[PDB]
Tab-separated table of N, CA, C and O in Angstrom:
chain	number	residue	atom	x	y	z
A	1	UNK	N	0.847	-1.183	0.000
A	1	UNK	CA	0.000	0.000	0.000
A	1	UNK	C	0.886	1.238	0.000
A	1	UNK	O	2.037	1.209	0.440
A	2	UNK	N	0.334	2.334	-0.515
A	2	UNK	CA	1.020	3.617	-0.541
A	2	UNK	C	0.007	4.720	-0.272
A	2	UNK	O	-1.196	4.546	-0.473
A	3	UNK	N	0.506	5.863	0.188
A	3	UNK	CA	-0.344	6.986	0.545
A	3	UNK	C	0.210	8.275	-0.044
A	3	UNK	O	1.425	8.444	-0.178
A	4	UNK	N	-0.698	9.183	-0.392
A	4	UNK	CA	-0.360	10.503	-0.900
A	4	UNK	C	-1.057	11.555	-0.048
A	4	UNK	O	-1.881	11.239	0.814
A	5	UNK	N	-0.722	12.820	-0.299
A	5	UNK	CA	-1.275	13.926	0.480
A	5	UNK	C	-1.161	15.200	-0.338
A	5	UNK	O	-0.048	15.671	-0.594
A	6	UNK	N	-2.297	15.754	-0.750
A	6	UNK	CA	-2.356	16.860	-1.704
A	6	UNK	C	-2.969	18.086	-1.036
A	6	UNK	O	-3.385	18.050	0.123
A	7	UNK	N	-3.028	19.174	-1.802
A	7	UNK	CA	-3.893	20.319	-1.531
A	7	UNK	C	-4.518	20.703	-2.868
A	7	UNK	O	-3.798	20.950	-3.846
A	8	UNK	N	-5.849	20.728	-2.924
A	8	UNK	CA	-6.587	20.987	-4.158
A	8	UNK	C	-7.245	22.357	-3.986
A	8	UNK	O	-7.191	22.940	-2.899
A	9	UNK	N	-7.816	22.916	-5.051
A	9	UNK	CA	-8.640	24.118	-4.954
A	9	UNK	C	-10.062	23.749	-5.375
A	9	UNK	O	-10.437	23.880	-6.541
A	10	UNK	N	-10.849	23.269	-4.416
A	10	UNK	CA	-12.285	23.172	-4.601
A	10	UNK	C	-12.813	22.126	-5.561
A	10	UNK	O	-12.836	20.932	-5.249
A	11	UNK	N	-13.260	22.587	-6.735
A	11	UNK	CA	-14.129	21.788	-7.597
A	11	UNK	C	-13.402	20.626	-8.265
A	11	UNK	O	-14.023	19.594	-8.539
A	12	UNK	N	-12.095	20.743	-8.508
A	12	UNK	CA	-11.399	19.738	-9.307
A	12	UNK	C	-10.966	18.506	-8.505
A	12	UNK	O	-10.045	17.802	-8.933
A	13	UNK	N	-11.590	18.235	-7.357
A	13	UNK	CA	-11.453	16.924	-6.730
A	13	UNK	C	-12.132	15.860	-7.586
A	13	UNK	O	-11.649	14.724	-7.677
A	14	UNK	N	-13.239	16.217	-8.250
A	14	UNK	CA	-13.979	15.277	-9.087
A	14	UNK	C	-13.195	14.816	-10.312
A	14	UNK	O	-13.522	13.767	-10.876
A	15	UNK	N	-12.179	15.563	-10.740
A	15	UNK	CA	-11.346	15.120	-11.847
A	15	UNK	C	-10.232	14.180	-11.405
A	15	UNK	O	-9.575	13.580	-12.262
A	16	UNK	N	-10.015	14.021	-10.100
A	16	UNK	CA	-9.124	12.977	-9.600
A	16	UNK	C	-9.908	11.673	-9.724
A	16	UNK	O	-10.730	11.333	-8.870
A	17	UNK	N	-9.670	10.958	-10.817
A	17	UNK	CA	-10.481	9.821	-11.220
A	17	UNK	C	-9.700	9.037	-12.262
A	17	UNK	O	-8.837	9.605	-12.944
A	18	UNK	N	-9.961	7.731	-12.406
A	18	UNK	CA	-9.220	6.954	-13.409
A	18	UNK	C	-9.606	7.281	-14.843
A	18	UNK	O	-10.394	6.556	-15.456
A	19	UNK	N	-9.063	8.367	-15.390
A	19	UNK	CA	-9.247	8.655	-16.800
A	19	UNK	C	-9.559	10.095	-17.155
A	19	UNK	O	-9.171	10.565	-18.229
A	20	UNK	N	-10.262	10.804	-16.276
A	20	UNK	CA	-10.687	12.165	-16.577
A	20	UNK	C	-9.514	13.138	-16.508
A	20	UNK	O	-8.549	12.937	-15.767
A	21	UNK	N	-9.611	14.204	-17.297
A	21	UNK	CA	-8.564	15.207	-17.420
A	21	UNK	C	-9.048	16.544	-16.868
A	21	UNK	O	-10.209	16.707	-16.483
A	22	UNK	N	-8.134	17.510	-16.837
A	22	UNK	CA	-8.458	18.830	-16.319
A	22	UNK	C	-7.221	19.695	-16.211
A	22	UNK	O	-6.279	19.561	-17.000
A	23	UNK	N	-7.235	20.585	-15.218
A	23	UNK	CA	-6.106	21.487	-15.017
A	23	UNK	C	-4.953	20.782	-14.313
A	23	UNK	O	-3.812	20.817	-14.787
A	24	UNK	N	-5.232	20.139	-13.183
A	24	UNK	CA	-4.213	19.427	-12.425
A	24	UNK	C	-4.249	17.923	-12.711
A	24	UNK	O	-3.741	17.129	-11.921
A	25	UNK	N	-4.844	17.521	-13.831
A	25	UNK	CA	-4.784	16.144	-14.297
A	25	UNK	C	-3.957	16.003	-15.568
A	25	UNK	O	-3.943	14.926	-16.174
A	26	UNK	N	-3.277	17.059	-15.983
A	26	UNK	CA	-2.433	17.063	-17.172
A	26	UNK	C	-1.019	17.538	-16.886
A	26	UNK	O	-0.071	17.028	-17.486
A	27	UNK	N	-0.852	18.504	-15.981
A	27	UNK	CA	0.457	19.032	-15.615
A	27	UNK	C	0.784	18.754	-14.153
A	27	UNK	O	1.641	19.424	-13.569
A	28	UNK	N	0.115	17.772	-13.561
A	28	UNK	CA	0.251	17.409	-12.155
A	28	UNK	C	0.025	15.904	-12.056
A	28	UNK	O	0.213	15.177	-13.038
A	29	UNK	N	-0.321	15.432	-10.859
A	29	UNK	CA	-0.669	14.030	-10.642
A	29	UNK	C	-1.860	13.612	-11.497
A	29	UNK	O	-2.863	14.325	-11.582
A	30	UNK	N	-1.742	12.447	-12.132
A	30	UNK	CA	-2.804	11.896	-12.963
A	30	UNK	C	-2.955	10.414	-12.662
A	30	UNK	O	-1.970	9.669	-12.693
A	31	UNK	N	-4.185	9.993	-12.378
A	31	UNK	CA	-4.451	8.598	-12.070
A	31	UNK	C	-4.391	7.743	-13.337
A	31	UNK	O	-4.717	8.215	-14.429
A	32	UNK	N	-3.978	6.485	-13.221
A	32	UNK	CA	-3.998	5.576	-14.371
A	32	UNK	C	-5.404	5.027	-14.595
A	32	UNK	O	-6.344	5.340	-13.871
A	33	UNK	N	-5.529	4.182	-15.615
A	33	UNK	CA	-6.810	3.602	-15.993
A	33	UNK	C	-7.067	2.248	-15.347
A	33	UNK	O	-8.133	1.663	-15.568
A	34	UNK	N	-6.125	1.737	-14.558
A	34	UNK	CA	-6.295	0.459	-13.878
A	34	UNK	C	-6.177	0.655	-12.374
A	34	UNK	O	-5.463	-0.090	-11.696
A	35	UNK	N	-6.869	1.664	-11.851
A	35	UNK	CA	-6.694	2.106	-10.471
A	35	UNK	C	-7.366	1.118	-9.527
A	35	UNK	O	-8.593	1.076	-9.417
A	36	UNK	N	-6.553	0.322	-8.838
A	36	UNK	CA	-7.004	-0.516	-7.736
A	36	UNK	C	-6.515	0.119	-6.442
A	36	UNK	O	-5.324	0.415	-6.303
A	37	UNK	N	-7.428	0.325	-5.504
A	37	UNK	CA	-7.212	1.282	-4.443
A	37	UNK	C	-7.871	2.609	-4.773
A	37	UNK	O	-8.144	2.932	-5.932
A	38	UNK	N	-8.140	3.396	-3.739
A	38	UNK	CA	-9.075	4.492	-3.949
A	38	UNK	C	-8.795	5.637	-2.981
A	38	UNK	O	-7.739	5.689	-2.341
A	39	UNK	N	-9.761	6.548	-2.875
A	39	UNK	CA	-9.550	7.941	-2.498
A	39	UNK	C	-10.274	8.223	-1.188
A	39	UNK	O	-11.456	7.890	-1.045
A	40	UNK	N	-9.567	8.833	-0.234
A	40	UNK	CA	-10.148	9.276	1.029
A	40	UNK	C	-10.022	10.794	1.044
A	40	UNK	O	-8.938	11.329	1.302
A	41	UNK	N	-11.114	11.499	0.760
A	41	UNK	CA	-11.088	12.952	0.652
A	41	UNK	C	-12.159	13.560	1.544
A	41	UNK	O	-13.308	13.107	1.533
A	42	UNK	N	-11.783	14.588	2.305
A	42	UNK	CA	-12.740	15.302	3.141
A	42	UNK	C	-12.658	16.802	2.901
A	42	UNK	O	-12.015	17.244	1.946
A	43	UNK	N	-13.318	17.591	3.746
A	43	UNK	CA	-13.286	19.050	3.669
A	43	UNK	C	-12.341	19.566	4.746
A	43	UNK	O	-12.723	19.694	5.914
A	44	UNK	N	-11.105	19.854	4.354
A	44	UNK	CA	-10.132	20.433	5.271
A	44	UNK	C	-10.021	21.938	5.042
A	44	UNK	O	-8.986	22.470	4.644
A	45	UNK	N	-11.121	22.629	5.325
A	45	UNK	CA	-11.104	24.077	5.455
A	45	UNK	C	-10.788	24.512	6.881
A	45	UNK	O	-11.166	25.616	7.284
A	46	UNK	N	-10.111	23.658	7.651
A	46	UNK	CA	-9.855	23.890	9.062
A	46	UNK	C	-8.390	24.157	9.371
A	46	UNK	O	-8.094	24.787	10.393
A	47	UNK	N	-7.471	23.683	8.531
A	47	UNK	CA	-6.041	23.818	8.781
A	47	UNK	C	-5.320	24.620	7.709
A	47	UNK	O	-4.609	25.579	8.033
A	48	UNK	N	-5.482	24.256	6.437
A	48	UNK	CA	-4.659	24.810	5.361
A	48	UNK	C	-5.346	26.027	4.740
A	48	UNK	O	-5.849	26.000	3.616
A	49	UNK	N	-5.349	27.117	5.503
A	49	UNK	CA	-5.859	28.385	5.005
A	49	UNK	C	-5.163	29.520	5.735
A	49	UNK	O	-4.725	29.367	6.879
B	1	UNK	N	-14.354	6.506	-27.703
B	1	UNK	CA	-13.145	6.933	-27.011
B	1	UNK	C	-12.937	8.442	-27.038
B	1	UNK	O	-11.992	8.927	-26.407
B	2	UNK	N	-13.780	9.187	-27.758
B	2	UNK	CA	-13.545	10.615	-27.942
B	2	UNK	C	-13.841	11.408	-26.675
B	2	UNK	O	-13.091	12.329	-26.328
B	3	UNK	N	-14.922	11.073	-25.970
B	3	UNK	CA	-15.352	11.872	-24.827
B	3	UNK	C	-15.669	11.073	-23.571
B	3	UNK	O	-15.698	11.669	-22.486
B	4	UNK	N	-15.907	9.768	-23.666
B	4	UNK	CA	-16.374	9.016	-22.513
B	4	UNK	C	-15.229	8.682	-21.561
B	4	UNK	O	-14.047	8.809	-21.891
B	5	UNK	N	-15.608	8.265	-20.360
B	5	UNK	CA	-14.666	7.752	-19.373
B	5	UNK	C	-14.092	6.436	-19.887
B	5	UNK	O	-14.865	5.566	-20.305
B	6	UNK	N	-12.769	6.271	-19.933
B	6	UNK	CA	-12.164	5.025	-20.469
B	6	UNK	C	-12.541	3.751	-19.717
B	6	UNK	O	-12.593	2.688	-20.352
B	7	UNK	N	-12.807	3.762	-18.363
B	7	UNK	CA	-13.451	2.564	-17.798
B	7	UNK	C	-14.887	2.386	-18.265
B	7	UNK	O	-15.341	1.256	-18.466
B	8	UNK	N	-15.610	3.494	-18.445
B	8	UNK	CA	-16.976	3.408	-18.948
B	8	UNK	C	-17.000	3.112	-20.443
B	8	UNK	O	-17.956	2.504	-20.940
B	9	UNK	N	-15.960	3.530	-21.171
B	9	UNK	CA	-15.873	3.227	-22.597
B	9	UNK	C	-15.628	1.745	-22.845
B	9	UNK	O	-16.125	1.193	-23.835
B	10	UNK	N	-14.861	1.091	-21.969
B	10	UNK	CA	-14.613	-0.338	-22.119
B	10	UNK	C	-15.864	-1.145	-21.792
B	10	UNK	O	-16.078	-2.219	-22.367
B	11	UNK	N	-16.696	-0.645	-20.875
B	11	UNK	CA	-18.014	-1.231	-20.649
B	11	UNK	C	-18.908	-1.006	-21.865
B	11	UNK	O	-19.644	-1.907	-22.289
B	12	UNK	N	-18.845	0.197	-22.449
B	12	UNK	CA	-19.630	0.513	-23.639
B	12	UNK	C	-19.191	-0.314	-24.841
B	12	UNK	O	-20.029	-0.749	-25.640
B	13	UNK	N	-17.885	-0.547	-24.987
B	13	UNK	CA	-17.416	-1.371	-26.094
B	13	UNK	C	-17.619	-2.858	-25.817
B	13	UNK	O	-17.599	-3.660	-26.758
B	14	UNK	N	-17.830	-3.250	-24.553
B	14	UNK	CA	-18.117	-4.648	-24.242
B	14	UNK	C	-19.478	-5.074	-24.772
B	14	UNK	O	-19.615	-6.173	-25.319
B	15	UNK	N	-20.484	-4.217	-24.626
B	15	UNK	CA	-21.817	-4.503	-25.132
B	15	UNK	C	-21.895	-4.365	-26.649
B	15	UNK	O	-22.805	-4.928	-27.268
B	16	UNK	N	-20.929	-3.687	-27.268
B	16	UNK	CA	-20.833	-3.608	-28.720
B	16	UNK	C	-20.025	-4.753	-29.320
B	16	UNK	O	-20.374	-5.245	-30.396
B	17	UNK	N	-18.951	-5.190	-28.655
B	17	UNK	CA	-18.163	-6.294	-29.194
B	17	UNK	C	-18.873	-7.628	-28.987
B	17	UNK	O	-18.625	-8.580	-29.734
B	18	UNK	N	-19.778	-7.720	-28.008
B	18	UNK	CA	-20.588	-8.923	-27.875
B	18	UNK	C	-21.700	-8.951	-28.913
B	18	UNK	O	-22.068	-10.025	-29.401
B	19	UNK	N	-22.245	-7.781	-29.253
B	19	UNK	CA	-23.261	-7.717	-30.292
B	19	UNK	C	-22.718	-8.043	-31.668
B	19	UNK	O	-23.398	-8.678	-32.480
B	20	UNK	N	-21.487	-7.610	-31.956
B	20	UNK	CA	-20.863	-7.956	-33.227
B	20	UNK	C	-20.457	-9.421	-33.271
B	20	UNK	O	-20.521	-10.049	-34.335
B	21	UNK	N	-20.042	-9.985	-32.133
B	21	UNK	CA	-19.661	-11.392	-32.096
B	21	UNK	C	-20.879	-12.304	-32.151
B	21	UNK	O	-20.789	-13.410	-32.692
B	22	UNK	N	-22.013	-11.867	-31.593
B	22	UNK	CA	-23.231	-12.668	-31.662
B	22	UNK	C	-23.781	-12.739	-33.079
B	22	UNK	O	-24.412	-13.737	-33.446
B	23	UNK	N	-23.566	-11.693	-33.881
B	23	UNK	CA	-23.933	-11.759	-35.290
B	23	UNK	C	-23.037	-12.733	-36.043
B	23	UNK	O	-23.492	-13.418	-36.966
B	24	UNK	N	-21.761	-12.809	-35.662
B	24	UNK	CA	-20.865	-13.793	-36.255
B	24	UNK	C	-21.140	-15.191	-35.718
B	24	UNK	O	-21.015	-16.168	-36.463
B	25	UNK	N	-21.497	-15.304	-34.433
B	25	UNK	CA	-21.821	-16.603	-33.847
B	25	UNK	C	-23.089	-17.185	-34.461
B	25	UNK	O	-23.189	-18.402	-34.659
B	26	UNK	N	-24.066	-16.326	-34.762
B	26	UNK	CA	-25.261	-16.761	-35.477
B	26	UNK	C	-24.924	-17.218	-36.891
B	26	UNK	O	-25.489	-18.208	-37.372
B	27	UNK	N	-23.980	-16.534	-37.549
B	27	UNK	CA	-23.622	-16.862	-38.927
B	27	UNK	C	-22.954	-18.229	-39.035
B	27	UNK	O	-23.237	-18.983	-39.972
B	28	UNK	N	-22.066	-18.561	-38.092
B	28	UNK	CA	-21.395	-19.860	-38.107
B	28	UNK	C	-22.397	-20.980	-37.846
B	28	UNK	O	-22.317	-22.060	-38.447
B	29	UNK	N	-23.375	-20.726	-36.971
B	29	UNK	CA	-24.437	-21.696	-36.719
B	29	UNK	C	-25.310	-21.902	-37.952
B	29	UNK	O	-25.728	-23.029	-38.239
B	30	UNK	N	-25.581	-20.829	-38.704
B	30	UNK	CA	-26.415	-20.950	-39.896
B	30	UNK	C	-25.705	-21.690	-41.023
B	30	UNK	O	-26.361	-22.374	-41.817
B	31	UNK	N	-24.379	-21.568	-41.119
B	31	UNK	CA	-23.655	-22.327	-42.134
B	31	UNK	C	-23.553	-23.800	-41.766
B	31	UNK	O	-23.497	-24.654	-42.658
B	32	UNK	N	-23.520	-24.113	-40.466
B	32	UNK	CA	-23.444	-25.504	-40.030
B	32	UNK	C	-24.726	-26.265	-40.339
B	32	UNK	O	-24.675	-27.467	-40.626
B	33	UNK	N	-25.879	-25.593	-40.264
B	33	UNK	CA	-27.129	-26.198	-40.712
B	33	UNK	C	-27.095	-26.430	-42.217
B	33	UNK	O	-27.509	-27.488	-42.706
B	34	UNK	N	-26.588	-25.452	-42.970
B	34	UNK	CA	-26.582	-25.557	-44.424
B	34	UNK	C	-25.527	-26.538	-44.918
B	34	UNK	O	-25.700	-27.141	-45.983
B	35	UNK	N	-24.433	-26.710	-44.171
B	35	UNK	CA	-23.425	-27.691	-44.560
B	35	UNK	C	-23.923	-29.115	-44.361
B	35	UNK	O	-23.512	-30.022	-45.092
B	36	UNK	N	-24.799	-29.333	-43.379
B	36	UNK	CA	-25.374	-30.656	-43.178
B	36	UNK	C	-26.445	-30.974	-44.213
B	36	UNK	O	-26.680	-32.151	-44.509
B	37	UNK	N	-27.103	-29.951	-44.762
B	37	UNK	CA	-28.134	-30.189	-45.766
B	37	UNK	C	-27.522	-30.584	-47.104
B	37	UNK	O	-28.043	-31.468	-47.795
B	38	UNK	N	-26.422	-29.932	-47.488
B	38	UNK	CA	-25.745	-30.251	-48.741
B	38	UNK	C	-25.060	-31.611	-48.654
B	38	UNK	O	-25.049	-32.374	-49.631
B	39	UNK	N	-24.503	-31.947	-47.485
B	39	UNK	CA	-23.881	-33.253	-47.276
B	39	UNK	C	-24.899	-34.386	-47.348
B	39	UNK	O	-24.548	-35.510	-47.723
B	40	UNK	N	-26.162	-34.111	-47.014
B	40	UNK	CA	-27.208	-35.109	-47.205
B	40	UNK	C	-27.508	-35.329	-48.682
B	40	UNK	O	-27.975	-36.408	-49.064
B	41	UNK	N	-27.247	-34.328	-49.523
B	41	UNK	CA	-27.426	-34.451	-50.962
B	41	UNK	C	-26.153	-34.854	-51.692
B	41	UNK	O	-26.235	-35.493	-52.746
B	42	UNK	N	-24.983	-34.478	-51.165
B	42	UNK	CA	-23.720	-34.906	-51.759
B	42	UNK	C	-23.521	-36.408	-51.608
B	42	UNK	O	-23.038	-37.072	-52.533
B	43	UNK	N	-23.887	-36.961	-50.449
B	43	UNK	CA	-23.892	-38.409	-50.283
B	43	UNK	C	-24.984	-39.073	-51.109
B	43	UNK	O	-24.856	-40.253	-51.445
B	44	UNK	N	-26.054	-38.344	-51.433
B	44	UNK	CA	-27.031	-38.844	-52.391
B	44	UNK	C	-26.501	-38.747	-53.817
B	44	UNK	O	-26.767	-39.630	-54.640
B	45	UNK	N	-25.754	-37.680	-54.122
B	45	UNK	CA	-25.167	-37.523	-55.450
B	45	UNK	C	-24.097	-38.573	-55.714
B	45	UNK	O	-23.997	-39.097	-56.828
B	46	UNK	N	-23.283	-38.886	-54.701
B	46	UNK	CA	-22.323	-39.976	-54.829
B	46	UNK	C	-23.021	-41.325	-54.915
B	46	UNK	O	-22.499	-42.252	-55.544
B	47	UNK	N	-24.190	-41.455	-54.286
B	47	UNK	CA	-24.983	-42.669	-54.428
B	47	UNK	C	-25.575	-42.775	-55.828
B	47	UNK	O	-25.653	-43.876	-56.388
B	48	UNK	N	-25.968	-41.640	-56.416
B	48	UNK	CA	-26.538	-41.645	-57.761
B	48	UNK	C	-25.491	-42.003	-58.809
B	48	UNK	O	-25.746	-42.823	-59.698
B	49	UNK	N	-24.300	-41.410	-58.716
B	49	UNK	CA	-23.283	-41.627	-59.737
B	49	UNK	C	-22.592	-42.980	-59.596
B	49	UNK	O	-21.965	-43.442	-60.554
């Protein structure tokens, strides 16, 4: 198993997905098309601001 | 593949590649019926000659 830790800006969490593109899915981290393992995402408007 | 999700596109092409294969699977079955009908007459033709 492996773990990552990002900071996103709002709406483009939905583009973190096996295949979809966007702003930070082309010049940043991009998921592959055979993604086994998945995503734990919450609302951290409490620390990183 | 132009706009769909590539995991969803492989599901979409699965229902299309099975539909194209079922048309071919039906065709091989239809020739097997027709090959048995001619063989019933070819063995009659060899019986005649």
